[PDB]
Amino acid sequence: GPHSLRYFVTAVSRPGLGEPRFIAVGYVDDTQFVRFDSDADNPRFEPRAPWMEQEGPEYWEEQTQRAKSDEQWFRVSLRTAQRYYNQSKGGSHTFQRMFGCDVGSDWRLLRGYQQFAYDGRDYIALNEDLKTWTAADTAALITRRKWEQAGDAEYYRAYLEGECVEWLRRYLELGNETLLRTDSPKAHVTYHPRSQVDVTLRCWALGFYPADITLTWQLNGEDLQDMELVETRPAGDGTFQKWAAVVVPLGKEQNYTCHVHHKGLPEPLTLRW
């Protein structure tokens, strides 16, 4: 079945107050496994899941060194972006990068990512062909041309195809117990008085992994009037939670049904009050 390795990296400039803060976080599927945070006295790349802890010093050394190279790159990029955009000096700005690989059942690279944002907006991104770049604007075009001259795409492609998938594979091995689990949601419906005419029904899905789920209300088996659907959220114990609420006329509660689709469900649930 499908899996992903992804890194999320951010530098924020703090002018007059020090060097930009630089953080990189690594995820395998929905699970965080590593970080580097420049805010430390002796910043090192660091484990963030139990199953990474037995990686030897050569792992953390190498990764540290690569994170620190990127730190310097991000400082240069912040300065350059500000120049290319004609922005007033001072001001805090952010540069972000998101990168990694997806695999299917396949263990051949299904998709690779190398994308960047300045101040929270697309700056440049490697397209799905892993050969060409989309520049978000006139500024990022300068960068694209420079990355074209250097042949950066092919270099990233070798990473995406080779080392990225190779290390995802190792990580799934190390974390196989946790990373490979399917926790199916426990769902129920709660009833809350609203007014002499109506009530709220809240459909919950609790304790599920991975995060992806579809949770919905129907009225007479047709889809579905306003519904409140909260953003999927961490329980903090490696499972997720979600609910969807609908305001219903008193005496027609039995008309409405909640539906939950999730990988760990043999058959999608239907709940009714």
């Binding site: 990764q63 690569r66 990473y159």
Partner: peptide, 9 residues
């Protein structure tokens, strides 16, 4: 594994 950016912007 983390891979640093190859070339400057």
């Amino acid at each position: 594994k983390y891979r640093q950016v190859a070339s400057h912007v």
